PDB file of all heavy atoms in Angstrom:
ATOM      1  N   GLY R 309       0.831  -1.170   0.019  1.00 49.87           N
ATOM      2  CA  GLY R 309       0.032  -0.008   0.003  1.00 49.87           C
ATOM      3  C   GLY R 309       0.848   1.258  -0.013  1.00 49.87           C
ATOM      4  O   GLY R 309       0.857   1.986  -0.964  1.00 49.87           O
ATOM      5  N   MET R 310       1.578   1.469   1.069  1.00 51.44           N
ATOM      6  CA  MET R 310       2.525   2.594   1.187  1.00 51.44           C
ATOM      7  C   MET R 310       3.864   2.060   1.619  1.00 51.44           C
ATOM      8  O   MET R 310       3.929   1.273   2.594  1.00 51.44           O
ATOM      9  CB  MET R 310       2.012   3.654   2.172  1.00 51.44           C
ATOM     10  CG  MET R 310       2.893   4.881   2.308  1.00 51.44           C
ATOM     11  SD  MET R 310       3.213   5.665   0.734  1.00 51.44           S
ATOM     12  CE  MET R 310       4.242   7.029   1.291  1.00 51.44           C
ATOM     13  N   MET R 311       4.920   2.476   0.959  1.00 52.11           N
ATOM     14  CA  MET R 311       6.253   2.048   1.267  1.00 52.11           C
ATOM     15  C   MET R 311       6.676   2.661   2.654  1.00 52.11           C
ATOM     16  O   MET R 311       6.089   3.597   3.123  1.00 52.11           O
ATOM     17  CB  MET R 311       7.246   2.461   0.190  1.00 52.11           C
ATOM     18  CG  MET R 311       7.528   3.954   0.125  1.00 52.11           C
ATOM     19  SD  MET R 311       7.976   4.520  -1.513  1.00 52.11           S
ATOM     20  CE  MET R 311       6.353   4.572  -2.285  1.00 52.11           C
ATOM     21  N   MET R 312       7.744   2.093   3.230  1.00 52.10           N
ATOM     22  CA  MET R 312       8.145   2.442   4.573  1.00 52.10           C
ATOM     23  C   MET R 312       8.750   3.853   4.607  1.00 52.10           C
ATOM     24  O   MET R 312       9.819   4.096   4.043  1.00 52.10           O
ATOM     25  CB  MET R 312       9.127   1.404   5.077  1.00 52.10           C
ATOM     26  CG  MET R 312       9.677   1.756   6.460  1.00 52.10           C
ATOM     27  SD  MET R 312      10.750   0.426   7.035  1.00 52.10           S
ATOM     28  CE  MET R 312      11.878   0.248   5.683  1.00 52.10           C
ATOM     29  N   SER R 313       8.054   4.748   5.278  1.00 53.95           N
ATOM     30  CA  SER R 313       8.516   6.129   5.379  1.00 53.95           C
ATOM     31  C   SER R 313       8.555   6.549   6.828  1.00 53.95           C
ATOM     32  O   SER R 313       7.930   5.964   7.717  1.00 53.95           O
ATOM     33  CB  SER R 313       7.610   7.081   4.606  1.00 53.95           C
ATOM     34  OG  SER R 313       7.704   6.874   3.190  1.00 53.95           O
ATOM     35  N   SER R 314       9.296   7.625   7.094  1.00 51.75           N
ATOM     36  CA  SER R 314       9.517   8.123   8.440  1.00 51.75           C
ATOM     37  C   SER R 314       9.535   9.629   8.435  1.00 51.75           C
ATOM     38  O   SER R 314       9.973  10.281   7.449  1.00 51.75           O
ATOM     39  CB  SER R 314      10.812   7.550   9.023  1.00 51.75           C
ATOM     40  OG  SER R 314      11.915   7.962   8.211  1.00 51.75           O
ATOM     41  N   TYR R 315       9.150  10.239   9.548  1.00 52.95           N
ATOM     42  CA  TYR R 315       9.073  11.697   9.718  1.00 52.95           C
ATOM     43  C   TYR R 315       9.227  12.024  11.215  1.00 52.95           C
ATOM     44  O   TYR R 315       9.167  11.125  12.047  1.00 52.95           O
ATOM     45  CB  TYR R 315       7.812  12.273   9.138  1.00 52.95           C
ATOM     46  CG  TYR R 315       6.559  11.865   9.847  1.00 52.95           C
ATOM     47  CD1 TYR R 315       5.943  12.712  10.757  1.00 52.95           C
ATOM     48  CD2 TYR R 315       5.948  10.638   9.592  1.00 52.95           C
ATOM     49  CE1 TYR R 315       4.776  12.359  11.438  1.00 52.95           C
ATOM     50  CE2 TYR R 315       4.784  10.281  10.208  1.00 52.95           C
ATOM     51  CZ  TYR R 315       4.213  11.133  11.130  1.00 52.95           C
ATOM     52  OH  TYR R 315       3.042  10.740  11.783  1.00 52.95           O
ATOM     53  N   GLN R 316       9.395  13.289  11.486  1.00 53.04           N
ATOM     54  CA  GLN R 316       9.612  13.772  12.810  1.00 53.04           C
ATOM     55  C   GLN R 316       8.445  14.662  13.245  1.00 53.04           C
ATOM     56  O   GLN R 316       8.073  15.593  12.479  1.00 53.04           O
ATOM     57  CB  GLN R 316      10.894  14.541  12.947  1.00 53.04           C
ATOM     58  CG  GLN R 316      11.105  15.193  14.291  1.00 53.04           C
ATOM     59  CD  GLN R 316      12.465  15.866  14.380  1.00 53.04           C
ATOM     60  OE1 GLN R 316      13.252  15.873  13.427  1.00 53.04           O
ATOM     61  NE2 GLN R 316      12.805  16.430  15.543  1.00 53.04           N
ATOM     62  N   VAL R 317       7.833  14.415  14.378  1.00 49.23           N
ATOM     63  CA  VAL R 317       6.833  15.307  14.961  1.00 49.23           C
ATOM     64  C   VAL R 317       7.501  16.603  15.292  1.00 49.23           C
ATOM     65  O   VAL R 317       8.496  16.608  16.065  1.00 49.23           O
ATOM     66  CB  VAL R 317       6.132  14.698  16.178  1.00 49.23           C
ATOM     67  CG1 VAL R 317       5.186  15.631  16.802  1.00 49.23           C
ATOM     68  CG2 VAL R 317       5.453  13.387  15.761  1.00 49.23           C
ATOM     69  N   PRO R 318       7.033  17.756  14.810  1.00 47.75           N
ATOM     70  CA  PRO R 318       7.750  19.012  15.018  1.00 47.75           C
ATOM     71  C   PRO R 318       7.596  19.524  16.437  1.00 47.75           C
ATOM     72  O   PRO R 318       6.591  19.315  17.081  1.00 47.75           O
ATOM     73  CB  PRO R 318       7.132  19.943  13.962  1.00 47.75           C
ATOM     74  CG  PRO R 318       5.761  19.433  13.801  1.00 47.75           C
ATOM     75  CD  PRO R 318       5.866  17.931  13.913  1.00 47.75           C
ATOM     76  N   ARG R 319       8.632  20.231  16.901  1.00 46.45           N
ATOM     77  CA  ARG R 319       8.675  20.763  18.227  1.00 46.45           C
ATOM     78  C   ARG R 319       8.236  22.177  18.267  1.00 46.45           C
ATOM     79  O   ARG R 319       8.717  22.998  17.487  1.00 46.45           O
ATOM     80  CB  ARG R 319      10.106  20.641  18.787  1.00 46.45           C
ATOM     81  CG  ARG R 319      10.671  19.248  18.782  1.00 46.45           C
ATOM     82  CD  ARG R 319      12.091  19.170  19.316  1.00 46.45           C
ATOM     83  NE  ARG R 319      12.148  19.538  20.745  1.00 46.45           N
ATOM     84  CZ  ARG R 319      12.731  20.615  21.179  1.00 46.45           C
ATOM     85  NH1 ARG R 319      13.333  21.440  20.332  1.00 46.45           N
ATOM     86  NH2 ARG R 319      12.748  20.897  22.489  1.00 46.45           N
ATOM     87  N   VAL R 320       7.259  22.478  19.139  1.00 46.60           N
ATOM     88  CA  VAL R 320       6.658  23.804  19.196  1.00 46.60           C
ATOM     89  C   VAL R 320       7.391  24.657  20.224  1.00 46.60           C
ATOM     90  O   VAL R 320       7.897  25.718  19.903  1.00 46.60           O
ATOM     91  CB  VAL R 320       5.167  23.652  19.496  1.00 46.60           C
ATOM     92  CG1 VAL R 320       4.489  25.029  19.584  1.00 46.60           C
ATOM     93  CG2 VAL R 320       4.456  22.770  18.466  1.00 46.60           C
ATOM     94  N   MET R 321       7.348  24.255  21.504  1.00 48.28           N
ATOM     95  CA  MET R 321       7.917  24.985  22.594  1.00 48.28           C
ATOM     96  C   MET R 321       9.431  24.684  22.681  1.00 48.28           C
ATOM     97  O   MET R 321      10.002  24.145  21.734  1.00 48.28           O
ATOM     98  CB  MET R 321       7.230  24.633  23.917  1.00 48.28           C
ATOM     99  CG  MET R 321       5.708  24.560  23.761  1.00 48.28           C
ATOM    100  SD  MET R 321       4.907  23.925  25.234  1.00 48.28           S
ATOM    101  CE  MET R 321       5.337  25.164  26.435  1.00 48.28           C
ATOM    102  N   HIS R 322      10.034  25.090  23.758  1.00 45.50           N
ATOM    103  CA  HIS R 322      11.467  24.833  24.000  1.00 45.50           C
ATOM    104  C   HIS R 322      11.749  23.458  24.667  1.00 45.50           C
ATOM    105  O   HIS R 322      12.859  22.993  24.645  1.00 45.50           O
ATOM    106  CB  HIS R 322      12.136  25.927  24.728  1.00 45.50           C
ATOM    107  CG  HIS R 322      11.855  25.904  26.210  1.00 45.50           C
ATOM    108  ND1 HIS R 322      10.594  25.638  26.709  1.00 45.50           N
ATOM    109  CD2 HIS R 322      12.660  26.187  27.283  1.00 45.50           C
ATOM    110  CE1 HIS R 322      10.662  25.732  28.046  1.00 45.50           C
ATOM    111  NE2 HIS R 322      11.887  26.057  28.387  1.00 45.50           N
ATOM    112  N   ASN R 323      10.711  22.922  25.369  1.00 46.82           N
ATOM    113  CA  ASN R 323      10.889  21.671  26.075  1.00 46.82           C
ATOM    114  C   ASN R 323       9.936  20.582  25.488  1.00 46.82           C
ATOM    115  O   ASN R 323       9.434  19.719  26.231  1.00 46.82           O
ATOM    116  CB  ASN R 323      10.617  21.861  27.545  1.00 46.82           C
ATOM    117  CG  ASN R 323       9.280  22.549  27.806  1.00 46.82           C
ATOM    118  OD1 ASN R 323       8.809  23.333  27.000  1.00 46.82           O
ATOM    119  ND2 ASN R 323       8.646  22.224  28.933  1.00 46.82           N
ATOM    120  N   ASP R 324       9.731  20.629  24.178  1.00 42.95           N
ATOM    121  CA  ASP R 324       8.992  19.574  23.550  1.00 42.95           C
ATOM    122  C   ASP R 324       9.912  18.350  23.371  1.00 42.95           C
ATOM    123  O   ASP R 324      10.972  18.487  22.844  1.00 42.95           O
ATOM    124  CB  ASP R 324       8.383  20.004  22.207  1.00 42.95           C
ATOM    125  CG  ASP R 324       7.036  20.620  22.358  1.00 42.95           C
ATOM    126  OD1 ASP R 324       6.459  20.584  23.451  1.00 42.95           O
ATOM    127  OD2 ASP R 324       6.525  21.163  21.367  1.00 42.95           O
ATOM    128  N   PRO R 325       9.454  17.172  23.763  1.00 43.32           N
ATOM    129  CA  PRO R 325      10.296  15.986  23.585  1.00 43.32           C
ATOM    130  C   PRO R 325      10.443  15.604  22.126  1.00 43.32           C
ATOM    131  O   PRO R 325       9.590  15.866  21.295  1.00 43.32           O
ATOM    132  CB  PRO R 325       9.579  14.906  24.383  1.00 43.32           C
ATOM    133  CG  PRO R 325       8.174  15.355  24.370  1.00 43.32           C
ATOM    134  CD  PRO R 325       8.212  16.839  24.434  1.00 43.32           C
ATOM    135  N   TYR R 326      11.565  14.972  21.805  1.00 43.66           N
ATOM    136  CA  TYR R 326      11.856  14.503  20.467  1.00 43.66           C
ATOM    137  C   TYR R 326      11.077  13.275  20.163  1.00 43.66           C
ATOM    138  O   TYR R 326      11.043  12.346  21.015  1.00 43.66           O
ATOM    139  CB  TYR R 326      13.356  14.284  20.265  1.00 43.66           C
ATOM    140  CG  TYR R 326      14.174  15.547  20.336  1.00 43.66           C
ATOM    141  CD1 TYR R 326      14.565  16.088  21.520  1.00 43.66           C
ATOM    142  CD2 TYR R 326      14.610  16.151  19.175  1.00 43.66           C
ATOM    143  CE1 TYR R 326      15.361  17.225  21.594  1.00 43.66           C
ATOM    144  CE2 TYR R 326      15.380  17.272  19.215  1.00 43.66           C
ATOM    145  CZ  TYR R 326      15.738  17.830  20.408  1.00 43.66           C
ATOM    146  OH  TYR R 326      16.504  18.979  20.463  1.00 43.66           O
ATOM    147  N   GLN R 327      10.424  13.170  19.020  1.00 47.24           N
ATOM    148  CA  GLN R 327       9.586  12.041  18.672  1.00 47.24           C
ATOM    149  C   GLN R 327       9.666  11.791  17.148  1.00 47.24           C
ATOM    150  O   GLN R 327       9.709  12.748  16.389  1.00 47.24           O
ATOM    151  CB  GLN R 327       8.119  12.279  19.075  1.00 47.24           C
ATOM    152  CG  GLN R 327       7.820  11.902  20.530  1.00 47.24           C
ATOM    153  CD  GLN R 327       6.503  12.462  20.960  1.00 47.24           C
ATOM    154  OE1 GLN R 327       5.961  13.319  20.339  1.00 47.24           O
ATOM    155  NE2 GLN R 327       6.001  11.953  22.079  1.00 47.24           N
ATOM    156  N   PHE R 328       9.705  10.528  16.782  1.00 47.48           N
ATOM    157  CA  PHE R 328       9.767  10.138  15.400  1.00 47.48           C
ATOM    158  C   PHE R 328       8.821   8.988  15.204  1.00 47.48           C
ATOM    159  O   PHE R 328       8.539   8.190  16.083  1.00 47.48           O
ATOM    160  CB  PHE R 328      11.199   9.692  14.992  1.00 47.48           C
ATOM    161  CG  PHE R 328      12.244  10.708  15.179  1.00 47.48           C
ATOM    162  CD1 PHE R 328      12.889  10.919  16.358  1.00 47.48           C
ATOM    163  CD2 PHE R 328      12.610  11.527  14.081  1.00 47.48           C
ATOM    164  CE1 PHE R 328      13.860  11.885  16.509  1.00 47.48           C
ATOM    165  CE2 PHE R 328      13.598  12.486  14.215  1.00 47.48           C
ATOM    166  CZ  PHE R 328      14.182  12.669  15.419  1.00 47.48           C
ATOM    167  N   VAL R 329       8.277   8.841  13.976  1.00 47.27           N
ATOM    168  CA  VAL R 329       7.221   7.894  13.654  1.00 47.27           C
ATOM    169  C   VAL R 329       7.583   7.180  12.337  1.00 47.27           C
ATOM    170  O   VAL R 329       7.971   7.825  11.385  1.00 47.27           O
ATOM    171  CB  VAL R 329       5.879   8.614  13.506  1.00 47.27           C
ATOM    172  CG1 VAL R 329       4.830   7.747  12.868  1.00 47.27           C
ATOM    173  CG2 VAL R 329       5.322   9.080  14.853  1.00 47.27           C
ATOM    174  N   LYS R 330       7.481   5.858  12.365  1.00 46.15           N
ATOM    175  CA  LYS R 330       7.610   5.042  11.157  1.00 46.15           C
ATOM    176  C   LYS R 330       6.364   4.241  10.933  1.00 46.15           C
ATOM    177  O   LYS R 330       5.801   3.679  11.874  1.00 46.15           O
ATOM    178  CB  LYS R 330       8.839   4.119  11.264  1.00 46.15           C
ATOM    179  CG  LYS R 330      10.139   4.827  11.423  1.00 46.15           C
ATOM    180  CD  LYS R 330      11.313   3.975  10.920  1.00 46.15           C
ATOM    181  CE  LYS R 330      12.575   4.848  10.846  1.00 46.15           C
ATOM    182  NZ  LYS R 330      13.687   4.112  10.247  1.00 46.15           N
ATOM    183  N   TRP R 331       5.926   4.164   9.681  1.00 48.20           N
ATOM    184  CA  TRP R 331       4.672   3.473   9.336  1.00 48.20           C
ATOM    185  C   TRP R 331       4.813   2.757   8.003  1.00 48.20           C
ATOM    186  O   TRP R 331       5.719   3.082   7.218  1.00 48.20           O
ATOM    187  CB  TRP R 331       3.485   4.473   9.285  1.00 48.20           C
ATOM    188  CG  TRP R 331       3.533   5.465   8.185  1.00 48.20           C
ATOM    189  CD1 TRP R 331       4.518   6.366   7.924  1.00 48.20           C
ATOM    190  CD2 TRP R 331       2.537   5.638   7.204  1.00 48.20           C
ATOM    191  NE1 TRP R 331       4.211   7.095   6.788  1.00 48.20           N
ATOM    192  CE2 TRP R 331       2.983   6.689   6.348  1.00 48.20           C
ATOM    193  CE3 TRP R 331       1.302   5.018   6.900  1.00 48.20           C
ATOM    194  CZ2 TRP R 331       2.258   7.141   5.253  1.00 48.20           C
ATOM    195  CZ3 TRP R 331       0.542   5.514   5.838  1.00 48.20           C
ATOM    196  CH2 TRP R 331       1.046   6.514   4.995  1.00 48.20           C
ATOM    197  N   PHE R 332       3.934   1.824   7.772  1.00 47.54           N
ATOM    198  CA  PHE R 332       4.070   0.863   6.668  1.00 47.54           C
ATOM    199  C   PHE R 332       2.711   0.176   6.434  1.00 47.54           C
ATOM    200  O   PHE R 332       1.936  -0.013   7.378  1.00 47.54           O
ATOM    201  CB  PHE R 332       5.149  -0.183   6.994  1.00 47.54           C
ATOM    202  CG  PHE R 332       5.415  -1.142   5.880  1.00 47.54           C
ATOM    203  CD1 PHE R 332       6.129  -0.776   4.814  1.00 47.54           C
ATOM    204  CD2 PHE R 332       4.989  -2.448   6.023  1.00 47.54           C
ATOM    205  CE1 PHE R 332       6.421  -1.659   3.820  1.00 47.54           C
ATOM    206  CE2 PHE R 332       5.308  -3.347   5.040  1.00 47.54           C
ATOM    207  CZ  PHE R 332       5.999  -2.970   3.913  1.00 47.54           C
ATOM    208  N   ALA R 333       2.459  -0.213   5.191  1.00 47.63           N
ATOM    209  CA  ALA R 333       1.147  -0.829   4.837  1.00 47.63           C
ATOM    210  C   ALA R 333       1.301  -1.737   3.631  1.00 47.63           C
ATOM    211  O   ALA R 333       1.666  -1.295   2.552  1.00 47.63           O
ATOM    212  CB  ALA R 333       0.134   0.257   4.546  1.00 47.63           C
ATOM    213  N   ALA R 334       0.938  -3.017   3.822  1.00 48.59           N
ATOM    214  CA  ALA R 334       0.973  -4.028   2.746  1.00 48.59           C
ATOM    215  C   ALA R 334       0.093  -5.192   3.141  1.00 48.59           C
ATOM    216  O   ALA R 334      -0.322  -5.316   4.299  1.00 48.59           O
ATOM    217  CB  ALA R 334       2.396  -4.502   2.499  1.00 48.59           C
ATOM    218  N   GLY R 335      -0.139  -6.127   2.204  1.00 46.72           N
ATOM    219  CA  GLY R 335      -1.001  -7.231   2.408  1.00 46.72           C
ATOM    220  C   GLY R 335      -0.594  -8.436   1.610  1.00 46.72           C
ATOM    221  O   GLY R 335       0.140  -8.304   0.581  1.00 46.72           O
ATOM    222  N   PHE R 336      -1.074  -9.620   2.010  1.00 48.10           N
ATOM    223  CA  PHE R 336      -0.679 -10.899   1.431  1.00 48.10           C
ATOM    224  C   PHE R 336      -1.870 -11.716   1.018  1.00 48.10           C
ATOM    225  O   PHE R 336      -2.919 -11.646   1.651  1.00 48.10           O
ATOM    226  CB  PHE R 336       0.163 -11.706   2.457  1.00 48.10           C
ATOM    227  CG  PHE R 336       1.305 -10.912   3.047  1.00 48.10           C
ATOM    228  CD1 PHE R 336       1.297 -10.627   4.367  1.00 48.10           C
ATOM    229  CD2 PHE R 336       2.356 -10.522   2.281  1.00 48.10           C
ATOM    230  CE1 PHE R 336       2.326  -9.917   4.942  1.00 48.10           C
ATOM    231  CE2 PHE R 336       3.411  -9.852   2.806  1.00 48.10           C
ATOM    232  CZ  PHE R 336       3.399  -9.524   4.157  1.00 48.10           C
ATOM    233  N   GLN R 337      -1.679 -12.540  -0.011  1.00 48.87           N
ATOM    234  CA  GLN R 337      -2.693 -13.494  -0.470  1.00 48.87           C
ATOM    235  C   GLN R 337      -2.027 -14.564  -1.359  1.00 48.87           C
ATOM    236  O   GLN R 337      -1.135 -14.209  -2.151  1.00 48.87           O
ATOM    237  CB  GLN R 337      -3.790 -12.813  -1.251  1.00 48.87           C
ATOM    238  CG  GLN R 337      -4.957 -13.716  -1.647  1.00 48.87           C
ATOM    239  CD  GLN R 337      -5.614 -14.367  -0.463  1.00 48.87           C
ATOM    240  OE1 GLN R 337      -5.267 -15.506  -0.080  1.00 48.87           O
ATOM    241  NE2 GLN R 337      -6.623 -13.715   0.175  1.00 48.87           N
TER     242      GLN R 337
END
């Protein structure tokens, strides 16, 4: 469905914790 991609949740304040997200979508038959 969608190939494996990654991005970073952006930081708003000065003490926003660092966070990253990886996601993926496929199926079998």
Side-chain angles (χ1 to χ4, degrees):
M310 181 57 179
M311 71 208 78
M312 176 175 53
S313 292
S314 59
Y315 66 99
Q316 175 177 1
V317 176
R319 303 180 63 248
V320 180
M321 316 171 64
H322 77 319
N323 53 330
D324 272 353
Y326 292 82
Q327 276 166 343
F328 300 87
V329 167
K330 299 204 169 188
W331 69 301
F332 184 75
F336 309 113
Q337 186 56 268

